Symmetry: D2
């Protein structure tokens, strides 16, 4: 079955355009279910996960059409409010339809997500929020059911600033009676994008991007047209690629405000970075300086760039420590990096990376979306050739990584 | 030597006035060193740690006068910029004079803090910030020295949203040439109070309380008059006391905006809480519902109320999990709680509290400020009598806890 | 694709015969490569992993024949000493041919194992041991190569009492010149079985099952006939099944000496256990008492029964804590148990299990061998029907679990 | 108050005689309470902790006499079986009189140990064992009471191979009716010494030093004469001193069998070690090679040499990782090492030591017995002078460390 073949490459040089954010568009697609009319989403990335959630919207009876990076949803005449086991198992972001469906129908039944490659990942804080809004919660044979005679706005505190729980509860709150206050809200840029979309549909959401979100519920929302924000994680991936290959890459159609920790840490590692209004230039250093990273809720260092930064550190000039505070098990890639000659030792949530002279190409497997991209970055600097398996992990969340890296001068091909 | 004797008490009832914040006033006292004139701080709590940092200001040559909760500092004619080993060992918040002294003199030498009861507690992020502003850092026999021909404003990223590093770097930045940007800043209320004081002296500090602080440096600051914010941790201590004793307590001279996670979690445990503009009423439940707590950077659940909430949970109606993400070793109190008949098991940063019918009075020792207060709360509900040793831990950070609890109906005395 | 369907079952009752140990036979099959003649292994379990390592022996040029639980190996005329990427990826126990091949040929090249479902799982201690015996170690594009002009016996210390490193180093030492001492050796029963087999071939291995193994190297080993020990993990699985179903099961063809922690902990949970010379009877309690388990090196509680005991605890009468000290990531099953209505919270290496009234059948996926068996145990007690996917995990290490449970009265079928 | 002053020293050279084991003699002194007659213990080290437990024996009514490294106990006419709060707080090894007193009187009441510098340190496994022998356990105001009409031998499993629980339960079992089996027993050398002493008094204890101890109870024990084993931790301290100072030290009156992991790891770091029947010679390397250490139950690497090895690693030629699996909080020394210019970063139970060119003398505080000795070792290699406070930690468990190091050529003095 299919492989990505990467060879030892020249320093990457040129421009790369970044696609629309996967993690902005998935919650915004769920949010289209809130509205009694037709939404138009522009800058949608052509990714399998976008097409899976589209099929979940079709399952509940929305009219969905995709072409040329535009998705339209007519949720006027939704029929059903159950998300079946197969769709939630394909893509756990399926769970983000629970808030809108509860808000629209006052009842919903959603398959509970199971095991995940990067950790246990419970959805208790989502349920906490729905209960605070007056929903009664029951489990039935792997499904979570939430139902109420009417959602009522209430104050609630998030024990952790969960992205998904913030999104699900903001969407449920948008049609509740009265005012909801989410305390200790996630501050991620995708939260702001979602809130902006809800306000475009006629909602009243204030404070997104701060620690407190206030939602004043409205009776009805209407379809709206929205431009999704750029993918800050894809942008960061190409920025790391410039750092690791001693390259010179201009990343186009980005928002620097969303990349601050990645810019800071790449500068600490020795990159020269030029921030512009719609683009950033990254010049890799001749010697990578070892740095430590600690993943945290935004605007701390993002867990979605942890594997990529770890790959950079495998050839840094000394010892770097990577601490993962956000996910339990997000070190599955370490054994694959070690197959390529890295020197990485883990205990608990910390990995000690002892820089080596060079990586060596080897047969490796993608374990998840972001680690698979980290393996491509390893492959560009590893002596010889690297063959990466289980490539569906990568292909589901990066648009045409083979074409984009090829245009920057790298040696990469997908063999089917 | 001295003991606090607590007996099984009646439900606490009445009003308690909260003192000025220890953790607001300590950095604000350091900040008075920035100014060429006389500052006046009102609402200063009469605590030993306030009197120790006052003696450190006298050591560097400031004129300090304390009476009736007002402290005045004339830093016009500071002489020296070294903080010796004895003062830093007495109180590690001594380290917060490093930023102001570097900013005033372009040189400072500060004893590095050593072991602490609640964890290792490095000051690497403070030094990271001073280096970003152009200081060269050297160690000499237990001292850290920072020196520059001139501080220059620069962008810098905090790997963790350290309270102390945020404070130290904001104060150093206030007299630097140009603009400093602190990314991933601490959002704690004391950060806002300090920033407000710097702006009262003539600084230009924007964004305090958000994830990004921008400081535009000025050439000179002038003495100013400031009213310190209330002590949110003392307020939380009395709120927990009402919860544990099935009491009814109005906490006076507080800011509800600063207590949101404590209010939320006490409500989840079954308290009825009435929030007013300058006060909060807490009515304890007849049965405490078990809750989980996870400490986090503000506005997440504060590590400074973790031991007190754990004490509450020792008699809750089931199993509660306490996770400490902020400090390494902040479970030293567990063995003292277990001497009083608690059922607490720890592994790593998590403690599993299995509620018991009642605690039993025993001889126990305060291990640190907030745990010592938690032992007083245990003592109010424990059958018989509790004798608490090593009481300097408590007395250094609570104003007259014996008099305040006595006025709420509790049985407590300090025996010398 | 294929599923295991389990229904809510009657209490299990009857006898079950246990097969030969998977984890005894895999290293003993590698060990047959040490000998210049024909070995005969009896009591070999009919498992896919036995058939994969058999194909690896054929790959290096041994004559292998399997029938009716007997495997014969003629390693007289081995040809090659490389274990390719495909075979090591299929089954990481492939790596155990490295010691014998190094000992026979003074050179070997083995694909380094990559990611694993239950943790990173480095093989550094194996290499440490080969280096101590005089091998030079090099990496080539995902392979580890070990080579020497002659293995020489030496003292070496294991930083952790690794089962695999103990096995690999004992086998390499068996043909070395002089005496090897393994300090802090694994004490697992399979170590003793392997040592007994090496001594049957003419080796000199003393101390297996203690903390120190002494190997005096011989010039030549000869094929021998060996009876593999019973599978203590399969035995423990059926013992837990009796505990969870309030059953009464006699487990046949077992060694009680190998099951001591499982017997102790089942007795603590309320089981009545009768230990006999070749069999054990387990009578489940009417109420399961909550217990804590901490996995450790033998003769501590085995990590290979951790998921199964956790499943038992999901319906115990209170709160149980499971700590995994042996593997990093061995909690992937928790999310599947939670789909069936368990109440399990993890942080770090500890899981807090809050017993529920009953589990509910749901669609779940096996994540690994022992967790998949734990899901079958959940299925026997869960209301309704449970459908388990990814069943190759189970089928590769349990002989006919459907037929054995069916004969004890349970409702289980494999649908293809 | 009192300080230890250490200066930058010459390489240590010469012989040092090791004293009797503190951790052998403390349980053996408790064990003298089992006997109706006079015991004679030879090779007792002249330490404060020996004199505290002696005062506890006097408290319960034993006749105790100490002179010239010989302690005699006549426990013929013991009166009382309570260990009061003051004595247990002075020295938690006081708790080891619980087993003998329960065995002699069928009742005992012992103050429960509270907080400790190196972790929580519960005594649940001791109580588990006493309950298995038929004792009923109750808590009364900080005391644990154990009482029975008669101890009866039973099988029991230790969830962790606790040294103290093994000792306490073996001593209680020695006078029980019938046979006790301790499964997953501690294997530490002090367990063997204690068992040998019990057998000298007329007990029947088999398997000490293995994973299973069988005690066949006797009706009466008689006073006996015993030679305590050497202090393996003191021996290891001087061995590390030779390693760190590039010295050449013969450690006299030791048992190499008890030092295997320390010898192995010092050899891995580059020491040349000569093992003899009663002595070991350690020659420090000119460059220390970085090594990793993981503390474990004997015969794994001892937690009591972890701080000392960490100190060695602060100047090793690269990066070393220290993992503490045995104690929770045993990293309090890290902040003191960092005051001396070390580069140590901790997360969870792991510390990353990045070797520096040299340490610099500074004012530091002992946090516990073994860390305080590690600070002396730092002081011998640190530029200039080191002043160590809180020296009672050191003096309570090392005999004349100033005189022994002075005789090896080091510069050390105690100033009072
Ligand atoms: C669709 C989408 O946006 N997915 C992203 C979002 O996941 P989400 O699931 O919302 O993230 P969280 O809830 O903030 O999870 C953060 C932490 O909080 C715990 N938690 C979360 C929810 C809850 O109810 N209870 C609870 O305990 C949770 O287990 C985790 O440890 O945020 C993550 C963090 O940045 C990203 O890694 C993730 O990308 C992924 C990889 C991808 O592109 O495939
Ligand atoms: C004077 C004062 O305000 N002290 C308070 C302040 O400590 P501070 O020291 O500033 O807190 P941090 O820097 O936010 O520390 C948070 C975490 O960050 C790590 N870190 C901190 C700084 C650095 O350079 N490097 C680094 O790694 C650090 O080790 C810790 O794990 O904030 C703490 C957290 O809320 C409080 O518990 C503390 O109160 C105390 C108890 C009291 O009243 O005695
Ligand atoms: C074939 C076989 O016998 N496999 C078994 C054996 O694995 P092994 O791999 O030998 O186990 P370890 O080396 O004792 O591993 C124990 C720990 O030691 C770390 N370690 C191991 C080796 C090394 O070089 N370096 C190193 O750090 C390692 O990462 C782990 O955390 O022992 C395990 C522990 O009981 C079993 O779970 C495992 O069964 C499996 C599931 C199955 O049936 O599929
Ligand atoms: C008097 C004496 O011999 N003391 C020593 C002995 O302590 P002990 O207390 O017996 O050690 P453990 O019981 O083997 O403790 C090991 C681990 O087991 C947990 N545990 C222990 C008992 C129990 O009931 N429950 C439980 O959970 C415990 O918390 C720890 O994490 O063994 C330790 C380990 O080698 C030594 O560090 C210690 O020396 C000291 C420093 C000194 O010289 O001052």
């Amino acid at each position: 079955m299919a492989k990505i073949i990467v060879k030892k490459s020249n320093p990457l040089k040129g421009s790369v355009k970044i696609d629309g954010a996967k993690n902005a568009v998935l919650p915004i697609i769920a949010a289209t279910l809130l509205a009694n009319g037709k939404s138009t989403l522009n800058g949608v990335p052509n990714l399998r996960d976008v097409h899976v959630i589209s099929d979940l919207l079709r399952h509940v009876g929305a009219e969905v059409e995709y072409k040329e990076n535009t998705l339209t949803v007519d949720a006027s005449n939704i029929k059903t409010c159950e998300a079946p086991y197969e769709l939630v198992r394909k893509m756990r972001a399926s769970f983000l339809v629970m808030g809108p469906l509860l808000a629209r129908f006052n009842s919903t039944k959603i398959s509970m997500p199971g095991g995940d490659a990067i950790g246990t990942r419970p959805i208790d804080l989502h349920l906490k929020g729905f209960k605070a809004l007056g929903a009664k919660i029951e489990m039935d044979h792997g499904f979570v059911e939430a139902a109420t005679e009417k959602l009522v706005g209430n104050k609630l505190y998030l024990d952790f600033p969960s992205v998904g729980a913030t999104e699900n509860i903001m969407m449920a709150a948008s049609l509740a009676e009265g005012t909801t206050i989410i305390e200790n809200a996630a501050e991620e840029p995708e939260i702001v994008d979602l809130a902006n979309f809800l306000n475009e549909m006629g909602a009243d959401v204030k404070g997104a991007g701060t620690n407190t979100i206030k939602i004043k519920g409205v009776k009805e929302l209407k379809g709206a047209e929205h431009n999704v924000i750029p993918d800050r994680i894809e942008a960061a991936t190409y920025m790391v690629a410039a750092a690791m290959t001693k390259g010179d890459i201009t990343v186009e159609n980005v928002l620097m405000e969303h990349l601050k920790p990645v810019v800071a840490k790449l500068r600490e590692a020795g990159c020269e970075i030029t921030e512009m209004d719609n683009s950033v230039r990254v010049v890799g250093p001749k010697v990578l300086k070892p740095i430590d990273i600690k993943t945290l809720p935004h605007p701390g260092f993002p867990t979605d760039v942890q594997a990529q930064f770890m790959a950079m550190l495998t050839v840094a000039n000394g010892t770097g420590v990577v601490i993962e505070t956000v996910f339990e098990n997000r070190f599955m890639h370490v054994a694959e990096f070690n197959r390529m000659g890295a020197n990485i030792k883990i205990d608990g949530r910390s990995a000690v990376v002892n820089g080596v002279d060079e990586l060596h190409g080897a047969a490796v497997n993608a374990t998840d979306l972001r680690a698979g991209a980290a393996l491509i970055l390893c492959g560009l600097i590893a002596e010889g050739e690297t063959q990466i398996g289980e490539i569906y992990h990568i292909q589901r969340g990066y648009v045409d990584i083979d074409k984009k890296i090829t245009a920057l001068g790298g040696q990469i091909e997908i063999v089917e």
